[PDB]
Write a protein that binds this ligand. Structure first.
Ligand SMILES: N#Cc1cnn2c(Nc3ccc4c(c3)CC(=O)N4)cc(Cl)nc12
Ligand SMILES: N#Cc1cnn2c(Nc3ccc4c(c3)CC(=O)N4)cc(Cl)nc12
Ligand SMILES: [Cl-]
Ligand SMILES: [Cl-]
Lengths: 123, 4, 123, 4
């Protein structure tokens, strides 16, 4: 018999993105080649099958630094990290291949789906 | 607020 | 020029609630009289003006235990904590006064609003 | 997915 506040989940996510911008309670640095990205482990796990697996691991759960595969593109990661915290995906002709490969690695199925559909439409 |  | 995934914020919140149920990466215990509630500081701040103030404080940000005012009802807190993690509010005739007083203390304006409207309709 |  609950009532539901429609905008609640979006409001929570907006405030989690504000915490990320102010670097408040971030507990991990994701290293992608020469670039570093600070984030909240809980948000990373909630968005990504790869981070969900990493941070449920009894040893990796305590790491403050996670290094991604050297083939991962920093801009592609940046775009996906922004997506995680906002629901908005900056998908462009110039970045779509990098975004799709990063989303496959990060196990972000909905992003992979849409990248596949946008690529199929251009061929 | 809504009835979900 | 971003695209947006409509269900993303709800999916994130569902996974944050799953982490809470499994007690994964919870970093605080909220003590309400004889009861204890484990949560994620980032979610508490994102939902509550009181926790936002508490966890931005340079000393309180590092506490693992937060004790609420002894006048706060544990069930009222439990209902609001569930709301924070689900967008669903279990508002009933038997709990509405406790929920409203807890929401005022926690500074959860949207919950206070609706409690006020449900009370006004019954008088 | 939508145009926001
Ligand atoms: N507890 C918990 C918890 C935290 N996070 N999380 C999941 N995170 C996840 C796992 C796989 C995938 C995605 C998110 C997006 C995607 O495409 N795949 C799943 C579950 Cl079943 N549980 C949890
Ligand atoms: N950074 C950050 C950040 C984390 N959380 N958070 C806010 N959390 C909040 C503050 C006040 C109120 C509510 C939530 C619900 C309500 O009724 N009042 C606000 C801002 Cl402006 N910023 C942040
Ligand atoms: Cl996704
Ligand atoms: Cl609220």
């Amino acid at each position: 018999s609950c009532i539901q506040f429609t905008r609640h989940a979006s409001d929570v996510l907006l405030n989690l993105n504000r915490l990320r911008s102010r670097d408040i309670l971030t507990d991990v640095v994701i290293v992608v080649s020469r670039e570093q990205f600070r984030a909240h482990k809980t948000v990373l796990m909630a968005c990504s099958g790869l981070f969900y697996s990493i941070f449920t691991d009894q040893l990796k759960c305590n790491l403050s630094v996670i290094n991604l595969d050297p083939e991962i593109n920093p801009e592609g990661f940046c775009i996906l990290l922004d997506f995680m915290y906002t629901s908005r995906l900056n998908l462009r002709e110039g970045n779509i291949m990098a975004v799709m490969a990063t989303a496959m690695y990060l196990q972000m199925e909905h992003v992979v789906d849409t990248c596949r559909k946008f690529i199929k439409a251009s061929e | 607020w809504v009835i979900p």
